[PDB]
């Protein structure tokens, strides 16, 4: 067992979430999927060695909806439990995702803005391993109005990416999305990403297109049976 510890230090309420990868060897049962987390609050669970899923935080949830309509960044089906077959998040949600005991005897995480951003996380560990983060806020100059997922007062609170934003207006053959002519890493240059210099430049560590990951995976690595802690909105 390891213990994750996923702490929302915002100034708002969060309700975060986990999910499963469907080819993960383990599975995450001490902790429901979703929870309430007040401003300045934290929630502490054991999880199995070689788990493999990601965290995400919601923003705006009424659970009066049902399905991912009930959160404005971030829902799932289920509502505040997220399904353990569909609960993924829908874009923007900004992902802390975790592939423990992987190749090598090595745990693999990392943040990942790729489908677009809604909060600011830092993942750290007590083992003096890499620790990521997106800390600064890519809401307010979220630099596109398509790409911008606003409240009832009009304030931005996520940023989608281009290839979410539709802004190509071509999901199925995009050099934003990595789809169709473009759909393997020869074709889909990050250089071709619109606005990726925008992510990438507020939070490098963070992933922006579809072969970050392929690229910076070995940032991002820890085998010394560290605990973890996911933290919104850190100092």
């Known amino acids: 067992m390891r213990t994750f510890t996923i702490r929302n230090n915002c100034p708002f309420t969060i309700w975060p979430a986990h999910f499963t990868n469907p080819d993960s060897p383990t599975k995450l049962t001490s902790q429901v999927a979703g929870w309430d987390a007040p ?3 934290q929630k502490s669970f054991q999880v199995p060695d ?3 899923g990601r965290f995400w935080g919601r923003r705006n949830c009424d659970f009066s909806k049902q399905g991912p309509s009930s959160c404005a960044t971030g829902g799932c089906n289920g509502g505040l439990i997220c399904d353990a077959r569909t609960g993924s998040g829908v874009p923007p949600a900004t992902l802390a995702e975790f592939k423990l005991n992987g190749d090598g005897g090595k745990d693999y995480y990392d943040v990942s803005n790729v489908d677009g951003s809604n909060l600011p996380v830092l993942i750290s560990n007590n083992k003096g391993c890499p620790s990521p983060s997106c800390r600064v806020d890519l ?3 979220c630099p596109e109005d398509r790409m911008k997922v606003k409240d009832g007062r009009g304030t931005t609170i996520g940023c989608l990416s281009a290839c979410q934003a539709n802004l190509d207006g071509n999901h199925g053959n995009s050099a934003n999305c990595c789809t169709g002519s473009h759909g393997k890493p020869e074709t889909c240059p990050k250089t071709g990403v619109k606005y990726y210099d925008y992510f ?3 939070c490098p ?4 297109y579809a072969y970050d990951e392929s690229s910076q995976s070995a940032l991002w690595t820890c085998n010394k049976g560290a605990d973890y802690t996911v933290t919104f ?3």
């Open 205 to 208: 560590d963070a992933y922006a």
């Open 39 to 41: 401003a300045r609050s």
């Open 50 to 52: 070689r788990w493999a």
């Open 233 to 235: 909105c850190p100092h």
């Open 139 to 141: 809401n307010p100059g």
């Open 200 to 202: 990438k430049g507020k």
